[PDB]
Design a protein around this ligand. Structure first.
Ligand code: O75
Length: 215
């Protein structure tokens, strides 16, 4: 695998979104992974619909949280996911709507990364594209991140409470990192992104619940 990967440089990553008043991080993480695969398959970069997932993935709890694997499974069973334009984001759970011409991507299943294995996560990011990951984002140091390679020894790898998207990896001034796209707007972190410590004993649980969709 390469030493450094950044899918933003290849045009595989859409603009940073803002989930607003809804605990729908999982839907943003899921659509980000789908968007990367759609770009890889077709050449098209476009916004897929987190709202379609919030409203329709009945195994998840809409604005009260969810898993990305449940989302991928839904998109597969549903035979598609709508574009953002067809099924726009409203930031509250509503009834599941059917748009006859709304479909913009499909999913053929998913794979999970071996639990806790950062080398395996790296290899998947290199081979596949952006990968959905879960982390402990509960610390003030994370919430108020602005710069650098984030590491806090108080982060709890077993407290997975936020879903984000690994869009690459690399090294900054000798500190290995994951490049992480959040869904709290461009005004959060570094233009909506955070660099998280890599190969520091699975810091914040970054490799504990990682998955990517098949397309
Ligand atoms: C985002 N946004 C976000 N916000 C909250 C708090 C506001 C609702 C919680 C979560 C969340 C993330 C994750 C993840 F992605 F990190 F893994 C997991 C959960 C969660 O606790 N789940 C249940 C855990 N167990 C039953 C052991 C996942 C879940 C939640 C609801 C329905 C299905 C699955 C929460 N993200």
């Amino acid at each position: 695998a390469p030493d450094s990967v950044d899918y933003r440089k290849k045009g595989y990553v859409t603009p940073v979104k803002n989930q607003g008043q809804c605990g729908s991080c999982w839907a943003f993480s899921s659509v980000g992974a789908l968007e990367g695969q759609l770009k890889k398959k077709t050449g098209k970069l476009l916004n897929l619909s987190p709202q379609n997932l919030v409203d329709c993935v009945s195994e998840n709890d809409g604005c009260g949280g969810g898993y990305m694997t449940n989302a991928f499974q839904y998109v597969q069973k549903n035979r598609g996911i709508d574009s953002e334009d067809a099924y726009p984001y409203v930031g509250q759970e509503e009834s599941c709507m059917y748009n006859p011409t709304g479909k913009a991507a499909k999913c053929r299943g998913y794979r999970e990364i071996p639990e806790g294995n950062e080398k395996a996560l790296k290899r998947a990011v290199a081979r596949v594209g952006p990968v959905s990951v879960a982390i402990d984002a509960s610390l003030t140091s994370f919430q108020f991140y602005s710069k650098g390679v984030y590491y806090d020894e108080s982060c709890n790898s077993d407290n997975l409470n936020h879903a984000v998207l690994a869009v690459g990896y690399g090294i900054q001034k000798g500190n290995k990192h994951w490049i992480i796209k959040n869904s709290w707007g461009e005004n959060w972190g570094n233009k909506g992104y955070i660099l998280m410590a890599r190969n520091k004993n699975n810091a914040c649980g970054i490799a504990n619940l990682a998955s990517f969709p098949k397309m």
